[PDB]
Amino acid sequence: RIPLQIVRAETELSAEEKAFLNAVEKGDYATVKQALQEAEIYYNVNINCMDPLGRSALLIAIENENLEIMELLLNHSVYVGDALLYAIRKEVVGAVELLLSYTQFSEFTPDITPIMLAAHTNNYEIIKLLVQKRVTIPRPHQIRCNCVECVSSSEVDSLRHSRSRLNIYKALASPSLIALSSEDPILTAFRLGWELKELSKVENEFKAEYEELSQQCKLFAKDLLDQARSSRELEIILNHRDDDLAKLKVAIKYHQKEFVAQPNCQQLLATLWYDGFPGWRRKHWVVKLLTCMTIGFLFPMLSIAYLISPRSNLGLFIKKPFIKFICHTASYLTFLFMLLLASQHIVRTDLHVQGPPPTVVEWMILPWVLGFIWGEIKEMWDGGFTEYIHDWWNLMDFAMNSLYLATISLKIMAYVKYNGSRPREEWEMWHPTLIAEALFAISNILSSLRLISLFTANSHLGPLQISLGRMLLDILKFLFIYCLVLLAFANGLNQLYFYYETRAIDEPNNCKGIRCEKQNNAFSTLFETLQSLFWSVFGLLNLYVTNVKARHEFTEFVGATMFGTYNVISLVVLLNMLIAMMNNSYQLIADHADIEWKFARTKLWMSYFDEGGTLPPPFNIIPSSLIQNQHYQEVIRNLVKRYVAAMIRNSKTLTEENFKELKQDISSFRYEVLDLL
Amino acid sequence: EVIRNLVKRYVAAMIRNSKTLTEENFKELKQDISSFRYEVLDLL
Amino acid sequence: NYEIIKLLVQKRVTIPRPHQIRCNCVECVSSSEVDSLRHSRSRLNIYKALASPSLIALSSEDPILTAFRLGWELKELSKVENEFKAEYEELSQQCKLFAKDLLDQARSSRELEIILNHRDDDLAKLKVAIKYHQKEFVAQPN
Amino acid sequence: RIPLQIVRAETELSAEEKAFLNAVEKGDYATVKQALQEAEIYYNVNINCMDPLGRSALLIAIENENLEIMELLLNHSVYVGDALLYAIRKEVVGAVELLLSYTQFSEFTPDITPIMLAAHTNNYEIIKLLVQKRVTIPRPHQIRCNCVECVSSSEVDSLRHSRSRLNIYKALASPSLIALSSEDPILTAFRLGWELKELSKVENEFKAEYEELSQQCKLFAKDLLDQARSSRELEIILNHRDDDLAKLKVAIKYHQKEFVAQPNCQQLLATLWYDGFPGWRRKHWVVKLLTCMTIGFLFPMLSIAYLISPRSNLGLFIKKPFIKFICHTASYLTFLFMLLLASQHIVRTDLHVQGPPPTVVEWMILPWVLGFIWGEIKEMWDGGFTEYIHDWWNLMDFAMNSLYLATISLKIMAYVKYNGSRPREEWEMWHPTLIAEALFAISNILSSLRLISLFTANSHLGPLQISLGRMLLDILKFLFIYCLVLLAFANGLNQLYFYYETRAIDEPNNCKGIRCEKQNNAFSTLFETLQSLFWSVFGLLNLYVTNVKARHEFTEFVGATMFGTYNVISLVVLLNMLIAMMNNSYQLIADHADIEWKFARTKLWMSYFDEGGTLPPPFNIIPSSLIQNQHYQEVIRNLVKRYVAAMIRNSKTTEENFKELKQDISSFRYEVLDLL
Amino acid sequence: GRMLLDILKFLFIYCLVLLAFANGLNQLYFYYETRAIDEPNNCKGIRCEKQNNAFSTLFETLQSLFWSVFGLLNLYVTNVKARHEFTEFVGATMFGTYNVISLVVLLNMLIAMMNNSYQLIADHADIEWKFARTKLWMSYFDEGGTLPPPFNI
Amino acid sequence: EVIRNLVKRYVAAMIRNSKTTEENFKELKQDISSFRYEVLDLL
Ligand SMILES: Cn1c(=O)n(CCCO)c(=O)c2c1nc(Oc1ccc(/N=N/c3ccccc3)c(Cl)c1)n2Cc1ccc(Cl)cc1
Ligand SMILES: Cn1c(=O)n(CCCO)c(=O)c2c1nc(Oc1ccc(/N=N/c3ccccc3)c(Cl)c1)n2Cc1ccc(Cl)cc1
Ligand SMILES: Cn1c(=O)n(CCCO)c(=O)c2c1nc(Oc1ccc(/N=N/c3ccccc3)c(Cl)c1)n2Cc1ccc(Cl)cc1
């Protein structure tokens, strides 16, 4: 037996007052009209009867969109508090226009203003109605501001301060409002969406809300570009400078990947990319291969012509984007081929010469190594240090070029110090000629791996190269946990085995460590222990490394159980988890694979449009308006007109509330007919 | 006092969400029109 | 339906109180032995009514403690009355959502402080939320 | 400039008739009255107009459910053929009842009859109207009918014959038509669902449709059990014998898994399973663990008491299913423990004793061994051969007793023939004692693996064990491809290396093969080549087995390339492909894991319900009416009403619906305007 | 952490499989045990430079079947001094069947299960992490326990 | 001859399938509103 009773008692409503609410819904005017006329002198009933749910006299009329009755109650001087907000949310234009012709529980927070609520709805007609009468929106402060006004508000009421800012940005990011009161709608969406994404990181509490707003600004700019009907319209939009392809460049700066990947925008770029060959798309796959191979071979010939006679017909040939890409790639391809040839041409007798002179291959490589450094150095100035770090591929080019300078320094330095030939077996561990060779070989791996960035140009391999690269970030997080486990077990195993370290003189072949034919001293030092646990991930550490010379059966068993537990945690738990998180991340990435690849290829293409850097690495070392704005505003006017019509149609292409309205309309008509004679 | 306000705000929101179509609703519209027709025909 | 529940509750009404999760009450053993499938159904019917957000917001002294305690108890029934695990689990999710949605209507930092610092007999109410495993309530952005 | 024209032209419609067809949509009595009254005896025009899209006078009224214009048009003696089918499909009860009392283009195939179409729509009301009048449905022949009519009909028109059978089965599987006119709605749904499942296999071209019909029958029976409101009603349903728990036994036979897994049916079963322990569900986990150990450790006492005093108080405990289950499990564990004690007890001196006598452990274990054979023999005899093969675990049990028999026989032979003690190192390859020890050890693995079948009794292990068994069928299919790959590469590698075989005496330690410290002769014979390629999957074959004594560099390189290509196909392609197949398979199985596991546990529980076979194997061998139908029919009637009422309301909770509302207002507008 | 709970359920199946094959291999090889003195360097077991007596005792057999999961047990441990070809072949087939059931079947099924779990878990990761972080933060709100261990006393 | 019958069956089936929103709601509301004006102005 659990008795149930109203706990938070609320003042009840009289029977006659209750009939009024039915009277308000009744559809008759006299019953209310008599009450209001009698109420003025009688004082029997207050006109603004307050139902427990808070639907006062005005609100009940607005709910069903009854303008006739709404005006009936309106003229009697009934309460006019916050009824405009209820009308705006309802979206009944008639009620809003009529209303505009002028505790307290509310369903709206105190910061909501009529214009802000209208923008949240995205109703073009209602927003325009309120804009015609002068209105304003408060300007949001900067993301990172120590303003005295901003600081106090956060301290006084943190909850209200956060909600207010979100409400303001929802209004500002409304597509209908931007299309109405924005001078340059495309630029506004770019800036607004970028700012909304920055707030998605600082305001971590409501990151989901700000990302939804950011995505809605991105889609509006793309949808405005979808309305272009002619190639002239597209070119005017894409070449506009606020104060070539200037607007497209701004989109890349703000990461408008959907805007860039638009098919009509992509198709225009391909016309500039393939300038030399008008009918590239129609050509067969086999014919393309010969054409690309043919052009690459003449790359030295095309490059020289530009150097000597830039205005020559042949000289201008290397000025086209796609052909320049082939000439730059062909040059880099012969550099890599030469490195593969470095071993063959060397002679055995030179194996004993300390600090020899450069070889034939080294001489050939020399011009390009300098050219690579010069190219990277020049690129640093334009983009700045901050930009230079954004691209990982650019980071790799840094390591390869630094190592080449070190190889040159040591090779020359060894030339000065040493003069004769000595047996290489007698050289010290840190001989300059030995260190130089190691650094050169490390550069060769980096140089060859750099070729993978060229997969962006190809359409079959580009999307996969982009998807594989985006899986690496998730691998990086998983590497944090593995390092913790690797260090914990390395400390334990070294702590137990360092008592039994032996000397190389006592080992079978004078070899100490795990790189010997008979492995030993696997856990003698911490540096060796980390190496041993790394090599066990691939099964390259033998199980007899757990025995000690003096057979201590307890110590050997404990050490082997440490090794066994590490193997389970690594190869049966951690490795399998990384597979599962890889599978999850891949599935999400595939949805955006096409757009992400098209954004990457656009950057690759636009990097070949400018004249600077036309000569490949080997040859770049040789020493020898109001009218424009007027046309933009005309296309923008037509673009917005088509967008407004299209969305209105899309909306009308359902709900219980709609069912109620139809039911009331029949009842409203029914009452008049019966009363009507 | 605060719990009173939270309940009132919560109650109002859910009612709006509830009214925001099943087959049975279609029958009601048909029935409403049917009743109107009969009275008017009988009505002079 | 809030309106109909209030209409009946105005007229003095009652709902039977369910016996604890484990009870050897003589009525309890007799009912289960005499007719199972009716003892089990009646128990689920009473808990569905008590887990109603409208019946909790109205006629409950502390709507948020009721939701915490009720939701926790329904999860316990889910493990024991394993024959009808899903039904109890769905009811438990209902109570957790109602408490979080109640906290979603706070409009000032003052209101939030009063709710989360209330001691039924600092952050006392939040400590009760952690003890009952009210994760959505604790994870609310405000 | 493609020119577009009406390639397949049809006779046009006269202007006056176009308004009429619109008029028949309008609801104008005058034009129809004047038309026929102007044409019935003038003969100027035929009122049975045919719209180009197939619509006619009767159809247009039916579409909007306008009975008056429909009723108005019928009395004029207009054409009626196939009107009932359109009315039935529309599901307008008034239209149908109006038609019952009085090559062309049709939207229905010629085999469809009014009763079949009504059943396809599952409209309870319209079906009852037709059944009240005498109607019939042709009986579908068996799946494999050499009947002349079926043989002839299939040859004449296979397309028509196949569609006729499917149409008849869609009607016979209608829940409304089973709840009405079926003596036993639950039994009919069981048999129909099983037959439809078999039909799916035979007619491979229409497996999807027959599966859907089979699944719909299974749901109907489960929903009738959902309408039970008391425990008394539930027991009547599940214990009915058409001519204990007999009805539930029929459900297990037909694989009605959802029926058996219904929470109320499962609750009643748990009460019979936990007889001794009324409050097992509420008990703590620790007390639960302690309780079973007590029963397990007392099974020899419980078992003996049953034999001496079956009717005494201590004898009834081993009769309770859950206690009996614990007694059998404890007995099987002591046998397994004795198996692990065989190695420790043996003595060194006995090593060289050819054909020894049974040891202490073999004496203790022997009672179990005979019991296991006796138990499996009895189950096979009564169960039947076909039932035995259904369970995979049954196959493993048969092999376990086969090996245990061979071990006993061989040791018996060894004792009789061999007399003295000789060193083991001098024994031949196939000495009887050596074979007996090998066969005994193989059985031990099977005996321990048999324990996995007891996971079904556990609520945290059973669902996983059931999921694992289903992934095994996906693995089996992938094995066919691997075997062909393994055989193809084995033949190629052996065909290149059999010229360089060497003798064992010419090897380092006189060891030949891949199980020596220095592996050799890895591809000298086909039998060895298969082993080498198998052990390569686990990385246990070293790369130096590709070299030959006479250094033929070309031959060695080609052999190592065969080995490398086999490695890529096996460990990079096929193995990774098996992971992808399994990952998808687990997703599908996981959804139905709960129902599948509950069905498996029910068969286990019902295994311990029977009075026979209570004694565990160690002691398995030792010296020495019309009223029932009436109650079932009353309960079935109540269930049907609740089901029909629920579905009628549940159904009532499109473009055509929009037109009906639009038409209703327009009709009101026209009459009102005409009305003064 | 939430994935570890599903791995534990897999250990039950693997443990019983590991015990069934360890029992069989030990039951077949225990007649051919040798003494450490008779072995090359006086070392006995599978941790020696030349592994031996892999299946001589039950305790050692369990360790050998564990180390074969990681490929660290050589295949010649299936031979005996008195070369009984039938016995050696049966022991190698026991070892082979264990490898198939473990590394081809059981290990793959564990990958399939862990894949299903991660998808289900990922939907509530944010809520569960925030619950965990709240408990961590509240532990530092109390005045007690302020001093770290080294100054705790 | 067979193609003629196949096309006829297909056209009927798709039409039936097709007929089985806010724009629809607006159209329905117009009928009642227009009807009321005629009745109000009807003699
Ligand atoms: C990590 N580990 C290892 O290092 N070495 C190498 C030792 C030096 O050679 C081993 O030889 C070894 C090992 N782990 C092994 O199996 C298991 C298998 C399952 C287990 N728990 N399951 C659950 C616990 C809680 C809930 C559910 C399941 C534990 Cl705990 C161990 N074995 C084989 C083994 C060896 C000897 C004996 Cl007596 C028993 C087993
Ligand atoms: C099967 N195989 C093998 O048995 N041995 C052992 C030989 C005896 O020791 C090897 O040493 C070996 C090998 N397979 C190797 O790599 C590749 C990698 C990719 C390849 N195609 N990709 C594409 C074809 C068409 C479209 C796209 C991709 C082919 Cl074809 C081979 N290598 C290493 C290697 C060795 C020498 C040279 Cl020159 C090159 C590579
Ligand atoms: C477990 N196992 C093993 O231990 N050793 C080591 C022996 C001692 O060194 C092996 O050498 C070995 C092995 N398993 C092997 O392949 C298969 C492959 C598939 C199979 N069935 N598929 C299906 C059955 C029914 C339905 C569908 C598929 C069977 Cl049955 C065996 N092989 C290689 C091999 C060796 C000799 C001959 Cl004659 C044939 C094959």
DSSP string, D515-579: SSSS---TTSSHHHHHHHHHHGGGT-S-GGGG--SS--HHHHHHHHHHHHHHHHIIIIIIHHHHH
Non-local (6+) Cβ contacts of E72 within 8 A are A539, A542, A543
H/E segment holding residue A4: strand A2-4
Backbone CA torsion sign across D280, D284, D288, D291 = negative
Instruction: Locate breaks in chain F with C to N over 2.5 A; list the residue preceding each.
Output: 20
For an interface test with E, the pick among C127, C138, C140 (most E C-beta atoms closer than 10 Å) comes out as C138
Nearest to D666, CA basis, from F34, A655, A520, E151: F34
User: Cα–Cα distance between A452 and D673 in angstroms, integer?
Assistant: 80
**Which of C123, C127, C135 faces E127 most closely, judged by CB atoms?**
C135
Residue type, A313: N
Task: Identify whether the C-beta of residue C111 lies closer than 8 Å to the C-beta of residue B5.
Answer: yes
Contact (Cβ atoms closer than 8 angstroms) between residue E13 and residue D468: yes
Chains that touch B (3 or more CB pairs under 8 A): A, C, D
- Residue pair E25/E75 in contact by the 8 Å Cβ criterion: no
Question: Looking at chain B from residue 1 to 44, which residues have their Cβ under 8 Å from any Cβ of chain C?
Answer: 2-3, 5-7, 9-11, 13-15
3-state secondary structure of D378: helix
What are the DSSP calls for E103-152, one per residue? IIIIHHHHHHHHHHHHHHHHTTHHHHHHHHHHHHHHTTTSSTT-S-HHHH
Residue partners of D219: CB distance under 8 A and separation at least 6 = D258
DSSP A307-355: HH-TTSTTGGGGGSHHHHHHHHHHHHHHHHHHHHTHHHH--GGGGGBSS
Q: Amino acid letter at D70? A: M
The rounded Cα F15 to chain-centroid distance in angstroms is 11
Rounded to the nearest angstrom, the distance between the alpha carbon of A502 and the centre of ligand 3 is 46
DSSP state of A574: I
Tracing tokens 């070989």 back to the chain, one arrives at A441
Q: How far is the CA of F34 from the centre of ligand 3 (A)?
A: 84
Contact D96, D87 (CB under 8 A): yes
* C-alpha distance from residue A565 to each of C111, D410, E4, E67 (Å): 53, 44, 15, 11
In angstroms, the CA A353 to CA A424 distance is: 8
Q: Kindly give the pairing relationship between strand C13-15 and strand A2-4.
A: antiparallel
Fill in the DSSP letter of residue D505.
Answer: G
Q: Is D531 in the pocket of ligand 3 (CB under 6 A)?
A: yes
What gap in Å lies between CA A74 and CA A57, rounded to an integer?
Answer: 9
Per the listing, tokens 């130089």 go with A436
The first and second tokens of residue A159, run together, are: 């909850």
Name residue E12's amino acid. F
Q: Which amino acid is at D478?
A: F
Q: Does C105 touch chain B (CB under 8 A)?
A: yes
| Sequence letter at residue A486 | L
Q: Which ligand neighbours the alpha carbon of D561 most closely?
A: 2
Residue A370 in contact with residue A622, Cβ under 8 Å?
no
Q: Which residues contact D543 (CB under 8 A, 6 or more apart)?
A: D560
Interface touch E16/D579, C-beta < 8 Å: no
Inspect the structure and tell me whether chains E and B have 3 or more CB pairs less than 8 Å apart.
no
What six digits make up the tokens of D520?
A: 């050799």
Rounded Cα distance, A321 and A331, in Å: 15
CB atoms within 10 A of CB D465: 19
Residue A149 parent element (H or E): helix A148-156
Ligand nearest to the CA of D536: 3
Q: How far apart are CA D667 and CA D660, in angstroms?
A: 11
Cβ pair D654, D409 in contact under 8 A: no
Nearest residue in chain F measured CA to CA from A649: F23
Amino acid in position A297:
F
| HEC-encoded secondary structure of F1-39 | CHHHHHHHHHHHHHHHHHCCCHHHHHHHHHHHHHHHHHH
C-alpha distances (whole Å) from A672 to each of A35, A67, C16 are 21, 16, 50
Quick one: CA dihedral F25, F26, F32, F33, positive or negative? Answer: positive
Angle D323-D324-D326 (CA atoms, 0-180°, nearest 5)? Answer: 65
- Other beta carbons within 10 angstroms of residue E57's beta carbon come to 17
Return the SS3 of A421: strand
Q: Which residues pair with D565 in a beta bridge?
A: none
Q: Which atom of ligand 1 is nearest to the CA of A560?
A: 8
Q: Give the chain F residue whose CA is nearest to the CA of D106.
A: F9
Q: Which among C24, C38, C84 is the nearest to D231, CB-wise?
A: C38
d(CA D639, CA D187): 14
Token representation of residue A373: 């450094």
Q: How far is the CA of A348 from the centre of ligand 2 (A)?
A: 30
| Cross-chain Cβ contact A666/B32 below 8 Å | yes
A159 touches chain C (CB under 8 A): yes
HSE-CB at E64 with a 13 A cutoff on CA atoms is 28
The residue count for chain C: 142
Residue D2, classified by CB atoms within 10 Å of its CB into exposed (0-12), middle (13-18) or buried (19+), is: exposed
CA separation for the pair A643, A636 (Å, rounded): 11
Distances (CA, A) of D301 to D288, D295, D298: 21, 9, 5
CA A380 to chain centre: 24
A394 is in an annotated binding site: yes
- Burial readout A642-673 (b: 16 or more C-beta within 10 A, e: otherwise): ebbeebeeeeeeeeeebbeebebbbebbbeeb
How many Cβ atoms from other residues are within 10 Å of residue D545's Cβ? 20
Q: Give, for C14, the enclosing helix (H) or strand (E).
A: strand C13-15
Q: Which distant-in-sequence residues (6+ apart) come within 8 Å of A177 by Cβ?
A: A119, A127, A171
Structural tokens at position E23: 């029992």
3-state secondary structure of E57: coil
3-class SS of residue A263: helix
DSSP D456: G
Measure CA D545 to chain center. Answer: 49
Q: Which atom of ligand 2 is nearest to the CA of D563?
A: 4
Residues pairing with D50 in the sheet: D56
| E92–D contact, CB cutoff 8 A | yes
CB contact under 8 A, C35 and D268: no
DSSP H or E segment with residue A2: strand A2-4
C-alpha D663/C-alpha D655 separation (Å) is: 12
Give percent helix, percent strand, percent coil of chain B, each to the nearest 5: 85, 0, 15
Residue C10, class by beta-carbon neighbours within 10 Å (0-12 exposed, 13-18 middle, 19+ buried)?
A: exposed
Helix (H) / strand (E) element for D343: namely: helix D342-345
Angle at A404 between CA A400 and CA A410, to 5 degrees: 145
User: Can you tell me the distance from the alpha carbon of D434 to that of E88, in angstroms, rounded to the nearest whole number?
Assistant: 11
D162 C-beta neighbours (distance < 10 Å), count? 14
Is residue D498 classed as helix, strand or coil in its secondary structure?
A: helix
Which residues of chain D neighbour F38 with C-beta distances below 8 Å?
A: 669, 673
b/e map B5-44, b = 16+ CB within 10 Å: ebbbbbbbeeeeeeeeeeeebbeebeeebeebeeebeeee
> What residues of C form the annotated binding site for Zn(2+)?
19, 23, 25, 28
| Residues of chain E neighbouring D515 (CB-CB closer than 8 A) | 75-76, 78-79, 88, 92
Q: Tokens 């690459």 belong to which residue?
A: A296
**Spatial CB neighbours of C19, under 8 Å, sequence gap ≥ 6:** C25, C28
CB C142 within 8 A of CB A166: no
How does DSSP classify residue E80? -
Q: Which residue reads 């080995």 in tokens?
A: D563
Q: Write out the two tokens for A310.
A: 């830039």
The tokens for E5 are: 């709970």
Q: Is A364 left (phi over 0), alpha (psi -120 to 50) or beta?
A: alpha
Ligand 2 atom nearest to CA at D568: 1
Q: Is E45 left (phi over 0), alpha (psi -120 to 50) or beta?
A: left
SS3 A189: helix
Shortest CA distance from E47: residue in chain A: A544
Contact E9 D464 (CB under 8 A): yes
| Distance from C-alpha of D174 to C-alpha of D128, rounded to nearest angstrom | 13
* d(CA B2, nearest CA chain C) in Å: 6
d(CA D524, CA D513): 9
Chain D: residue nearest F4 by CA? D8
Distance from Cα E15 to the centre of ligand 1, integer Å: 8
- Helices D626-651 and D231-238 pack at an angle, to 10 degrees, of 110
